[PDB]
Amino acid sequence: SGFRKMAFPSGKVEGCMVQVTCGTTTLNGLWLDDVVYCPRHVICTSMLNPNYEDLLIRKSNHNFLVQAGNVQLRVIGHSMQNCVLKLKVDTANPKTPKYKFVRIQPGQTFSVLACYNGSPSGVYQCAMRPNFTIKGSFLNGSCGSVGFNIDYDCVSFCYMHHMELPTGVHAGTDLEGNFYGPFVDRQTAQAAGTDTTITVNVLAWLYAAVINGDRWFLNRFTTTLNDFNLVAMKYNYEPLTQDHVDILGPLSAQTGIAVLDMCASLKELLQNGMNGRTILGSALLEDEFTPFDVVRQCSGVT
């Protein structure tokens, strides 16, 4: 029993975190096999409209100081891939896990290993919001921290941290260096666009709550998908699709509550609020747990 924001164990990623320094800029890099990946912003200096192709042509291998704990790694090649740099080093990381570089969808979750000066500091769960930002926790020095999921000892890296936007939310790239969302690694007035609530995730979390014994929000009503989606639009929730209904199939069967029956509960919660009650220790409707997250953590017993 219980339900927590639960990250994947971070050990496989900790053994890949290094420090990259170019001039007076220090940030984090990811060392896999004989390559270190880091944000190309490490080659910036005193910001408005940098030409990174020029900045990189002017660098030499010896300009990049890479430190893995107390060992310096000799850089033997450098190249740019979109908004990341690839620093080839003379030593393969003996701790490299099985890994993949995946790009995630908005509404999916991942674990973040926040690092500073190449040293891991903390681990937490994040979701990619519909507007392609993440609500992270990052301070100065966090550039190059990574996001990931783990499946049967394979690490799927999905996020490298770059910047903080004016509202305090965060933006970054996949490990191919392509930004999530309409953001750029330079100084502009860019801001997060309007966001929405991830409906399928809210429904998954109501299922988690039922599995854990919170039932007060259930009711005898069932709604249609079309009628529910009319309510979702009013409250800035994303539309629910039949694929979403299908994905919720296992949790629906385990609790015996049809997906469209739970939707009638969600409509009532949106229209009435909670009237002073809580669900899984929260007084708001939580949207940062996917159906997979609920299945991973919650009992399987039907």
Ligand X SMILES: *C(=O)c1ccc2[nH]ccc2c1
Non-local (6+) Cβ contacts of 223 within 8 A are 260, 263, 264, 267
d(CA 130, CA 126): 13
Minimum distance, C-beta of residue 73 to a second copy, in the bound complex (Å): 20
| Partner whose footprint covers residue 69, from a second copy, ligand X, none (CB < 5 to 8 Å by kind) | none
Q: Give the distance, in angstroms, between the CA of residue 266 and the centroid of all CA atoms in the same chain.
A: 25
Non-local (6+) Cβ contacts of 219 within 8 A are 264, 265, 268
List the x/- string, 143-162, binding to ligand X by CB under 6 A. x------------------x
Question: Binding of ligand X at residue 115 (CB under 6 A)?
Answer: no
d(CA 81, CA 101): 14
Question: Binding of a second copy at residue 1 (CB under 8 A)?
Answer: yes
Non-local (6+) Cβ contacts of 100 within 8 A are 154, 155, 156, 157
The kind and range of the H/E element at 211 are: helix 199-211
Minimum distance, C-beta of residue 283 to ligand X, in the bound complex (Å): 33
Minimum distance, C-beta of residue 162 to ligand X, in the bound complex (Å): 4
Q: 143 an active-site residue? A: yes
Question: Binding of a second copy at residue 192 (CB under 8 A)?
Answer: no
**How many residues lie near a second copy (CB under 8 A)?**
42
By CB under 8 A, the residues from 4 to 23 that bind a second copy are 4-12, 14-15
Question: Binding of ligand X at residue 170 (CB under 6 A)?
Answer: no
Question: Binding of ligand X at residue 29 (CB under 6 A)?
Answer: no
Q: Using the rule CB under 6 A, which residue among 174, 185, 288, 293 binds ligand X?
A: 185
What SS3 class is residue 178? coil
d(CA 21, CA 65): 5
> Of residues 22, 41, 83, 263, which has the active-site annotation?
41
- CA-to-CA separations, 20 to 68, 106, 214, in angstroms, rounded: 9, 30, 48
Q: Using the rule CB under 8 A, which residue among 91, 121, 131, 190 binds a second copy?
A: 121
d(CA 86, CA 89): 9
Q: 41 an active-site residue? A: yes
Residue (154 or 230) nearer to a second copy, CB: 154
Contact of 104 with 1, CB cutoff 8 Å: no
Residue (8 or 217) nearer to a second copy, CB: 8
Non-local (6+) Cβ contacts of 165 within 8 A are 133, 171, 183, 190, 191, 192
Q: Which residues of the chain form contacts with ligand X (CB under 6 A)? A: 27, 39, 41, 143, 162-163, 185-186
| Residues designated catalytic | 41, 143
Q: Which residues of the chain form contacts with a second copy (CB under 8 A)? A: 1-12, 14-15, 113-114, 120-126, 135-139, 164, 168-170, 212-213, 278, 281-284, 296-297, 299
